[PDB]
Amino acid sequence: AKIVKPNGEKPDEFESGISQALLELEMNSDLKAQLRELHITAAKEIEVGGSRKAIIIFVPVPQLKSFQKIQVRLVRELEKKFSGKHVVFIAQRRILPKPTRKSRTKNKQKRPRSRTLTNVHDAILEDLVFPSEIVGKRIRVKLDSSRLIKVHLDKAQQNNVEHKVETFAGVYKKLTGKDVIFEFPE
């Protein structure tokens, strides 16, 4: 469809506008059968370095892998409706708080590792650069407590994401609050 939120909440003008572009694209393209079974949860547009902005289209986790097969086509087509706006597709994963000794509860179900903050933040980093692939990951712990993550992407698919490394840093900083610099080693 267009958008199916979990709760009874309704999208705003921008999230509905992105949903309108998705249903309109499926009507007059080869993505008809693939976009009918898929939908999105939310779509938030943020700003990046300079006078540029990018949007973050959230997709449910069970529909993530099916969304990756057509992401290379959806990114090029959606960036034509919004020229100076990059698009990214990051799944909507929930982070469960770790079980402390103060929060009163009865039957918490062990908090699986997939819901940990470390696993979610690493999964977001992978889906943010889906056309490429993380080949290595460094953590530059500077002189102070502030660290810096250095992600090593594939040498291939570089001509596609060589300009989105600035948007990937702004998106990952907006969702997780971490500094990331991307490199392309050989």
Place this chain on the structure above:
Amino acid sequence: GGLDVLQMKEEDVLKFLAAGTHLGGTNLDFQMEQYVYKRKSDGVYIINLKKTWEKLLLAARAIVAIENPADVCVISSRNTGQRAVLKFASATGSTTFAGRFTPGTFTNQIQAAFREPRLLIVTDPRADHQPLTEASYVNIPTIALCNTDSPLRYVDIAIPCNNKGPHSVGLMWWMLAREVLRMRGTISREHPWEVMPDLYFYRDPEEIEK
């Protein structure tokens, strides 16, 4: 020397190839592996001539930093560099020990032949191990023409070159003598030096009479 005027020209690299300054024997020291370009098929290690030129000017900078030229000591124990260091000492103004270095020359103060320089320059670190070891008891730096199979036990400026070989060692003493004089107000650096590199070449007594 990292400038543009301190780069070796075509006539300098031709003399290194003619003498054999890049040939570095069959053995290799782990301290000299950064100065070797690539080992040949016959086990010979090729010494990088560009890195030799950088260590040569770095050696010439330390020599000019010595105010009194007499405070520089140029020791050569082997016959291959006896007359080379004598012409080097005369061209610059430094001291020299062309014969046999008497033990205790730098340490035994009451000895007659007692000389305390400010900068030691030896030909072969292995053949001149006694002047190097004795200079360690004092604060005497070291500039040595180090081959590939040459230990850097007490070497401060290792000049990678073919220390063994009459034409090879004589050219290095001639190259250093020119760069030390060029860094001073003696040579214009545009006209080639009048002194030929054949004046520093050790000649066997069989070839002198002919």
Place this chain on the structure above:
Amino acid sequence: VRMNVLADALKSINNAEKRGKRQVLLRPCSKVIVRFLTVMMKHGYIGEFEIIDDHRAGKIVVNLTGRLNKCGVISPRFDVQLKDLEKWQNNLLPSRQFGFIVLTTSAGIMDHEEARRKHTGGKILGFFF
């Protein structure tokens, strides 16, 4: 086998420091090591370090500033109260003017001076001076 990976980390740093090295690679990475290297870095004993993150325990490459004399651990990891902390300072630290004893308290891994200000004790990891 490999027990007390923090000991193998500080032993590698202490050795590489005496050899005059500038960078030392630590094979097993741990949050206890990073919390230990951060306290050593906040006082100007080691430089920056990159946590090389493979899909395993991970490795660390630490820069050395030549200011460290010796870094070691206390293997039994005794429980240090706020009253017995003064006794550990005299035995381990070479002087009352410098050197630190990294403790593990409920407020986090920190040195002995910070444990006095926060008024809390715990277990002792090691020392560095």
Place this chain on the structure above:
Amino acid sequence: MQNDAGEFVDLYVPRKCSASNRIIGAKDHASIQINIAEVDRVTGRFNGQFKTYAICGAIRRMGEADDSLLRLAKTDSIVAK
């Protein structure tokens, strides 16, 4: 070292090794303080400026005295990379 009032009480501040930050002892006779002259940009002649480097006896005896001076020359833009 100070006397908590601005009084430097050390009778002499020794030289730290420019390669390993090691204190050069008063009886470290193998220690070396070598000076490297600076040349002019246009003519490459000696002007009067030089750079000082101190290497202790341990580093020098070990054999890492020439590599340390080489890295120290590249840092101060003395020899080419």
Place this chain on the structure above:
Amino acid sequence: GRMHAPGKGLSQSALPYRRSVPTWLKLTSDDVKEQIFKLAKKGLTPSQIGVILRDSHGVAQVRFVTGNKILRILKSKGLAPDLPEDLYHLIKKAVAVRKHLERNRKDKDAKFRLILVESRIHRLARYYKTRRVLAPNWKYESSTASALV
């Protein structure tokens, strides 16, 4: 080093960092599970099934194409053997040594190896009882073990 012998050799596999299936691998999760079921029925241990898929079908890691390991795929369907593969091969070796030891009576080397294998059987079975993989009444009997292999 080893557990019952000297030697500090490190000859093991080095898995890559990329936890993703390559682009040239078109076998989906369902296709891989069908291959495992066919190979598990004909009597192939999980170690042998992964070897065939790796060297003939290009499946570098079954854990990546699917969401579970090879043993969990068989345990879910119900094709996992009664006793684990590693414990089965230790008992298989002990029976072979003991059968050789009852014919050759004065080979003190084989008698020494039988103690080493049976020591590994008891410690491996002890780990399985803690994980509730084996019944608490399980016990390796040197006489009745030949009927289990």
Place this chain on the structure above:
Amino acid sequence: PLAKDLLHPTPEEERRRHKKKRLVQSPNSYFMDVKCPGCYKITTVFSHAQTVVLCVGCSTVLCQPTGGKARLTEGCSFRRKQ
């Protein structure tokens, strides 16, 4: 080797050292497309095949298990993939 850069080593050293003693461990193996001279179907074969690999629905043998890499049969061309 007193000040050696351990974070950015040259690829010649990483390729030379053991697969486990690298900065980040990586296998020395790969996958290849063995092409039988008679048939035309492409079959992905592991470098160290460790198993007698034959074409499915044919007779020709592709590889032979050895101590290290598999010894491919004569005429069986291959190419590695990444």
Place this chain on the structure above:
RNA sequence: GGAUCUCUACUUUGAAAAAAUUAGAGUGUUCAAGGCAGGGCCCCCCAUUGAAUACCCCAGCUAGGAAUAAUGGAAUAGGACCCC
């Protein structure tokens, strides 16, 4: 006894505790060891005359912290929430 998840042992507080002894506050037995008394003003008054305080392992009790070290939770699921 490897690494890994928000970046009941340990630890801190309180309660409770025979004094004497020890540490220690006050106080010129002529000083001191000690004592617990005694000082100041012209029939009293002032210094609430004083006769403090600390320590009292471990265990038990209580209230915080959640790093470190153990430990449990959903896998032949009806497991957690609803539905009702």
